Design goal:
This is Protein HIT1. This protein is 8% helix and 8% strand. It contains one helix and two strands, in the order ββα. The N and C termini lie far apart (50 Å). The structure holds zinc ion (2 copies). One zinc ion (ZN) binds next to loops.
């Protein structure tokens, strides 16, 4: 029966596969270290400075 609610998330950086990995800094979900160690889509600006 319908008990599942899709208890998973997609990579918010490439939107390719599931975001199995998570960034404890911003709260983003990435599919792997590929999108983790990115500085184009994986933005760590936080504030202006
Ligand atoms: Zn981050
Ligand atoms: Zn990704």
């Amino acid at each position: 029966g319908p008990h599942m609610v899709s208890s998973a998330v997609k990579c918010g950086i490439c939107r390719g596969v599931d975001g199995k990995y998570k960034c404890p800094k911003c709260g983003v979900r990435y599919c792997s270290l590929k999108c983790y160690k990115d500085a184009a889509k994986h933005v760590h600006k936080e504030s202006e400075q």
